[PDB]
Amino acid sequence: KSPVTLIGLGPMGQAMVRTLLGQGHPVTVWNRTPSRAEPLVVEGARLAASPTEAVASSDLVILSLTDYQAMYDILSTAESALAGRTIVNLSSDDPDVTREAAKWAAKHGATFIAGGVMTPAPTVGTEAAYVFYSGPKSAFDAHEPVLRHIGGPRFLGEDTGLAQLYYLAHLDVFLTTLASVVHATALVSAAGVDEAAFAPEAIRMVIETGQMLAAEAETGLELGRNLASGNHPGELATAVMMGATADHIVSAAKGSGVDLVLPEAVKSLYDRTVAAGHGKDSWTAMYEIIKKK
Amino acid sequence: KSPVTLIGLGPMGQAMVRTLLGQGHPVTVWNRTPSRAEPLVVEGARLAASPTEAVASSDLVILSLTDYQAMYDILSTAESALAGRTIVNLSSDDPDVTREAAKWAAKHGATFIAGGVMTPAPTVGTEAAYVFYSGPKSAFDAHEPVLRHIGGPRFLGEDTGLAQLYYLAHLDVFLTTLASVVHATALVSAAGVDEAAFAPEAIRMVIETGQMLAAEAETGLELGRNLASGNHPGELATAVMMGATADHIVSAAKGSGVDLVLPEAVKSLYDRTVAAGHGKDSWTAMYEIIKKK
Ligand SMILES: [Cl-]
Ligand SMILES: [Cl-]
Ligand SMILES: [N+]
Ligand SMILES: [N+]
Ligand code: NA
Ligand code: NA
Numbered sequence: 001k002s003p004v005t006l007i008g009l010g011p012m013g014q015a016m017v018r019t020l021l022g023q024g025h026p027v028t029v030w031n032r033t034p035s036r037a038e039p040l041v042v043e044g045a046r047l048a049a050s051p052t053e054a055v056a057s058s059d060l061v062i063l064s065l066t067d068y069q070a071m072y073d074i075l076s077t078a079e080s081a082l083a084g085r086t087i088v089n090l091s092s093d094d095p096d097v098t099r100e101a102a103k104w105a106a107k108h109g110a111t112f113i114a115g116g117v118m119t120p121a122p123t124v125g126t127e128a129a130y131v132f133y134s135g136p137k138s139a140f141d142a143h144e145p146v147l148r149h150i151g152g153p154r155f156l157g158e159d160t161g162l163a164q165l166y167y168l169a170h171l172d173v174f175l176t177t178l179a180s181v182v183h184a185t186a187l188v189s190a191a192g193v194d195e196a197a198f199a200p201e202a203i204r205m206v207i208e209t210g211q212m213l214a215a216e217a218e219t220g221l222e223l224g225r226n227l228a229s230g231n232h233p234g235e236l237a238t239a240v241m242m243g244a245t246a247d248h249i250v251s252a253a254k255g256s257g258v259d260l261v262l263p264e265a266v267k268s269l270y271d272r273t274v275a276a277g278h279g280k281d282s283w284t285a286m287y288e289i290i291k292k293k
Numbered sequence: 294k295s296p297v298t299l300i301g302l303g304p305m306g307q308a309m310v311r312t313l314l315g316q317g318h319p320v321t322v323w324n325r326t327p328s329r330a331e332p333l334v335v336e337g338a339r340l341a342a343s344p345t346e347a348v349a350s351s352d353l354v355i356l357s358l359t360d361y362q363a364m365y366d367i368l369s370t371a372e373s374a375l376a377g378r379t380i381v382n383l384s385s386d387d388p389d390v391t392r393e394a395a396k397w398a399a400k401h402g403a404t405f406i407a408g409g410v411m412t413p414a415p416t417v418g419t420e421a422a423y424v425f426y427s428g429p430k431s432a433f434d435a436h437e438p439v440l441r442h443i444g445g446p447r448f449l450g451e452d453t454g455l456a457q458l459y460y461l462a463h464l465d466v467f468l469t470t471l472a473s474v475v476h477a478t479a480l481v482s483a484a485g486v487d488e489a490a491f492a493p494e495a496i497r498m499v500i501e502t503g504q505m506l507a508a509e510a511e512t513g514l515e516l517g518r519n520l521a522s523g524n525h526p527g528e529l530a531t532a533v534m535m536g537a538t539a540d541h542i543v544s545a546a547k548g549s550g551v552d553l554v555l556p557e558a559v560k561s562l563y564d565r566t567v568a569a570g571h572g573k574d575s576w577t578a579m580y581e582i583i584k585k586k
Contacts, residue, residue: 011529067537092537094544120529165484168542169477169491173498175539175559176473181506182580183469184462185520190585191458198462199517203506205466210500213474224492227478236304236413244360244385246468249461251387257585265558266468287475292483292550 001025004146005054007074008064009036011121012090016064016150017045019125023149030054032074052078060143061087061110068093068101083109086139088147090115090131095161095168102135102160111139114160115147116167124151134162177206183262187249190256223284232278232285239286240279243270294318297439298347300367301357302329304414305383309357309443310338312418316442323347325367345371353436354380354403361386361394376402379432381440383408383424388454388461395428395453404432407453408440409460417444427455470499476555480542483549516577525571525578532579533572536563 001024006017009031020027021044029037030048037047048054055061055078063071068091075082087110089101098114105112113135123129129151133140140147140155147153156162181202188198213223226232246267253263269286278285294317299310302324313320314337322330323341330340341347348354348371356364361384368375380403382394391407398405406428416422422444426433433440433448440446449455474495481491506516519525539560546556562579571578 092541094541094548096544096548159484162484164541165481165545166491166494168538168545169480169495170498171538172477172480172542172556173470173473173495174502175535175542176476176555177466177470177499177502178506178576179559179562179579180466180469181516182520182577183583184465185517186580186584187462187465188458189520191452191455195520195580196517198459199520201459202462202466203503203516205463206470206499206506207503209467209470210496210503213471213496213499223474223496224478224489227475227482227488227492242468245461245464248385248387248457249465249468251389252458252461255387255389259562259583261558261561262469262583263465265554266472268554269472269552283471284475286472287479287488290476290552290555291479 002060002146003028003058004060004062005029005048005058006062006064007031007051007054008070008091009040010064010066012117012124013062013064014040015121015124016062018043019151020146020149021045022125025146025149028054028057030074050077051075052081054078055081055085059085060146061085063087063089063091065089065091067091068097071101072104079108086111086113086143088113088115088133088143090117092116092167092171093164095165098164099159099161111136112160113139113143114163116163118167118170119151125149126151128152130154132156132163132166134158135160179262181206183253183258186258187253187256190258221282221284226282226284227287230288232282232287234281237283238280239270239273239283242283243267243274243279246270295353295439296321296351297353297355298322298341298351299355299357300324300344300347301363301384302326302333303357303359305410305417306355306357307333308414308417309355311336312444313439313442314338315418318439318442321347321350323367343370344368345374347371348374348378352378353439354378356380356382356384358382358384360384361390364394365397372401379404379406379436381406381408381426381436383410385409385460385464386457388458391457392452392454404429405453406432406436407456409456411460411463412444418442419444421445423447425449425456425459427451428453472555474499476546476551479551480546480549483551514575514577519575519577520580523581525575525580527574530576531573532563532566532576535576536560536567536572539563 003026005028017040027045029045102112116132119129134156184202189195249263272289273286296319298321310333320338322338395405409425412422427449477495478492482488542556565582566579
């Protein structure tokens with residue numbers, strides 16, 4: 001029932017406005033290009049005349065924009081209207097950038113919560129969606145009914161930067177895993193193999209890797225246990241054994257003219273893990289090379 | 294029923310000997326350290342006195358060793374015994390190294406097949422196992438009954454180097470995906486978060502990435518189609534959008550003191566994909582940067 005303002009009418013913003021309207025919230029919108037609001041107005045949203053009018057329409061302002069610079073640019077003329085309101089910014093950006101935004105919000109009398117939407121826009125309003133939130137817990141609690149309708153809110157803690165830290169760490173896995181599927185297909189296709197023949201196998205290897213990591217079995221790898229305890233017991237997957245394979249991938253890529261930066265990064269991790277004395281330890285010992293000193 | 298020689302009694306070799314013995318094959322073994330043969334002899338294997346005697350015991354010689362250099366070293370004294378036999382080498386190595394081994398085998402009158410065991414040793418002899426093979430198809434066919442008992446043989450073609458090319462491309466996905474899970478956990482734990490809290494989420498992200506790639510849906514990404522056709526239609530996952538996220542991961546890692554080589558490799562792929570004019574294309578357009586010219 002409580003009114004909401006949403007600025008940024010890309011695919012995520014449109015799905016959130018449709019969902020919130022369907023749950024009976026009055027929704028005021030604003031966008032750099034007003035034509036994108038027209039379908040939302042037909043569904044019952046109100047188009048604000050300016051960012052100031054948009055901000056003044058609700059106690060809760062949700063931002064879905066390309067980055068935090070877009071928030072500063074759009075809200076520049078509305079800064080004096082921010083006092084007493086809560087900004088929930090769902091845009092992706094560097095964690096320290098989001099922490100600086102919390103200082104700017106406070107300067108203008110606004111409460112600030114950062115969010116990170118973990119699932120695609122089609123999941124908004126369903127059981128599949130989930131969104132990280134961080135910032136003052138009392139603010140999260142005050143607006144939880146709205147955030148619940150968007151889908152699967154997960155409060156992480158009262159450091160504003162946590163939502164984008166967790167978001168970018170998830171995207172760290174996503175982007176790197178996806179790059180490796182393309183790189184592996186290139187390695188094989190350089191020999192003349194049809195890309196369509198091998199890409200499904202590279203995809204199955206991702207699935208198999210995830211199954212192995214999640215293994216149900218007591219004898220299987222316990223990755224979080226190794227990293228949390230600092231003990232990396234070498235079983236049948238040691239750093240020196242897997243590093244040898246990393247070396248063979250680099251030589252295979254070098255021999256076939258396939259780009260080297262990705263496999264050389266993996267080889268660098270294994271090279272330094274072995275050089276630090278962890279050769280007989282688990283490959284998970286690369287954590288001791290990667291982690292903050 | 295046909296006799297087999299197996300050299301290299303690490304975990305994979307031991308599982309293969311146990312399986313082949315259980316199917317009624319006479320199995321002759323040899324190992325650099327004879328003590329590792331003792332359990333296999335109790336199960337019914339015969340321990341050969343030398344590599345020459347091992348090779349002379351069977352028409353089929355299976356090698357399970359750390360690399361191809363170990364094959365040359367072990368079989369040096371047995372080279373004159375190789376004539377008329379088939380070597381199946383299941384050891385991992387660079388594809389061109391395996392092609393050079395096919396020349397050496399031919400020089401000594403032996404047929405040569407390369408294999409790549411894709412599943413862990415506990416899967417040997419079961420429906421879960423599968424092993425790539427490459428080399429002369431007539432040789433594969435002549436020994437297929439033995440290879441069938443080892444588990445899921447997959448003939449790839451008559452280029453000896455294919456088995457290890459496919460193996461290393463699978464391990465390309467495996468090692469890179471695993472490194473990203475550790476890197477992502479380090480990114481979050483640098484903020485003080487318990488590694489045991491976040492590692493399960495990084496693992497779930499691998500599973501989710503594999504599900505997305507294998508998507509059942511008609512609207513979902515068709516990775517193999519993009520790479521095979523050379524058409525990378527930009528939907529909601531463009532190279533410029535995902536490259537911006539790659540940039541944020543690099544700045545987050547730089548700010549928290551977490552190692553940069555892996556996220557900088559991903560950023561390098563996206564940077565060059567955008568700089569080549571593919572910014573509005575799918576992220577899969579990085580294939581045009583990675584692939585052999
Ligand atoms: Cl492991
Ligand atoms: Cl995609
Ligand atoms: N900033
Ligand atoms: N070689
Ligand atoms: Na924007
Ligand atoms: Na060996």
